[PDB]
């Protein structure tokens, strides 16, 4: 939802809203890799999401 909605904001052409999407989307992404990692491929997906060691938090 935050991805498609961010396209709408940029389509309306504020500076306090771009940074608002960042803290909202980056938090939602970290919830994904937290649940994708806790398992017994479903593990190789993480190697596809981050490749530069980013999101190592």
């Amino acid at each position: 939802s935050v991805c498609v909605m961010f396209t709408n904001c940029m389509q309306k052409f504020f500076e306090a809203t771009i940074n608002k999407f960042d803290k909202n989307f980056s938090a939602h992404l970290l919830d994904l890799l937290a649940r994708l990692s806790i398992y017994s491929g479903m593990a190789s997906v993480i190697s596809r999401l981050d490749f530069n060691g980013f999101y190592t938090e």
């Binding site: 190789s44 190697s47 596809r48 981050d50 490749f51 530069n52 980013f54 999101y55």
Partner: protein, 369 residues
């Protein structure tokens, strides 16, 4: 979505004329513009078959070639004469634009080293005025010569939405190292191999990358860092090909890190060990990327033409491309201390310095702000 291509100068004509010949054979099309009986999407470059090309004394060499039924040295001379025929060559491009269903891009082939430099600088300016929503990719070729070269770089850094560098120097080495030539008629055979294999995903539709804007927005993160270099190994598993593309011996270029990598595998290789090689490339650390943003490597497969074995091409966005500019920037100041306003050169001088700084700032963990 159709892509109308342009060819300027002796270079652009020769590479384009040999680009079409590589494409006409890769499809079942006779040089007489007639399909041979002998699945491949061919509506992007060809119009039902006629290629969508707008060329601009080498022209006579094409009209005598068997493919006849298929259609000074100052930068100021190129920009001046281009203004005198503003309405002439724009009549052709406009009549070729509306006749197409929905225009997508303008793949422009020109060398920045005589008239192709000054005329191409004129076109890339005029296209952004009338056509503001059309991508303009350029297959520019790198070689008073320092002057005409950098002046085009002023336009190529703010108008062209993409750029693929192909320098004759690094090509001449590969011409000497693995081909043992010592000629233009030979190095262009390698250029035509790079241009044709670049748009292999548009002509052969797969899961993704069915439009030019799909190949562009993935690599180029910001409007400024829009320079790409190529790598082509075949001159065997996917690991054999992926390891050879990252060697500096194969790149067509004479700290530093990558920004985005796209691999084109035109083989019949099974798509099950693909993720295994990418997994291995991460382990041995054969390439490094930017530290600030999340940079990943992408690999794409395709299908070779049955009318014509594993190959491989890599689209790279490397910061080490900044080196080629400095060679141009350096020789300019030397010619600036050796000899109506002479302000365009200095204004162009400033913006190239802004670009090089942006590259060397791209390798910093605080490239933001």
């Amino acid at each position: 979505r159709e892509i109308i291509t342009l060819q300027l100068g002796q270079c652009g004509n020769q590479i384009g004329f040999e680009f079409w010949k590589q494409l006409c054979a890769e499809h079942g099309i006779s040089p007489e513009g007639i399909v041979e009986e002998f699945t491949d999407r061919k509506d992007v470059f060809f119009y039902q078959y006629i290629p969508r090309a707008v060329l601009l004394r080498v022209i006579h060499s094409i009209l005598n070639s068997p493919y006849a039924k298929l259609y000074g040295n100052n930068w100021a001379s190129g920009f001046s004469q281009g203004e005198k025929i503003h309405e002439d060559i724009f009549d052709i491009i406009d009549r070729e634009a509306d006749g197409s269903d929905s225009l997508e891009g303008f793949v422009l082939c020109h060398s920045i080293a005589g008239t192709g430099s000054g005329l191409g600088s004129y076109l890339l300016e005029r296209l952004n005025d009338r056509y503001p929503k059309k991508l303009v990719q350029t297959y520019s070729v790198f070689p008073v010569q320092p002057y005409n070269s950098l002046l085009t770089l002023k336009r190529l850094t703010q108008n062209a939405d993409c750029l693929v560098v192909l320098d004759n120097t690094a090509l001449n080495r590969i011409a000497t190292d693995r081909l043992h030539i010592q000629s233009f008629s030979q190095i262009n055979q390698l250029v035509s191999t790079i241009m044709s294999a670049s748009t292999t995903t548009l002509r052969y539709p797969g899961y993704m990358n069915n439009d030019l804007i799909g190949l562009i927005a993935s690599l180029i993160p910001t409007p400024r860092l829009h320079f790409l270099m190529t790598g082509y190994t075949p001159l065997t598993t996917v690991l054999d090909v992926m390891r050879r593309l990252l060697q500096p011996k194969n790149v067509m270029v004479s700290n530093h890190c990558y920004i985005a990598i796209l691999n084109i595998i035109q083989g019949e290789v099974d798509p099950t060990q693909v993720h295994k090689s990418l997994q291995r490339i991460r382990e041995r650390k054969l390439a490094n990327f930017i530290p600030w943003g999340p940079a990943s490597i992408q690999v794409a497969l395709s299908r070779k033409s049955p009318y014509l074995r594993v190959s491989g091409l890599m689209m790279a966005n490397h910061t080490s491309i900044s080196s080629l500019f400095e060679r141009t920037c350096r020789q300019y100041d030397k010619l600036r201390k050796r000899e109506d306003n002479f302000d365009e050169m200095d204004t162009s001088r400033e913006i190239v310095q802004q670009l090089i700084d942006e590259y060397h700032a791209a390798t910093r963990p605080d490239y933001i702000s």
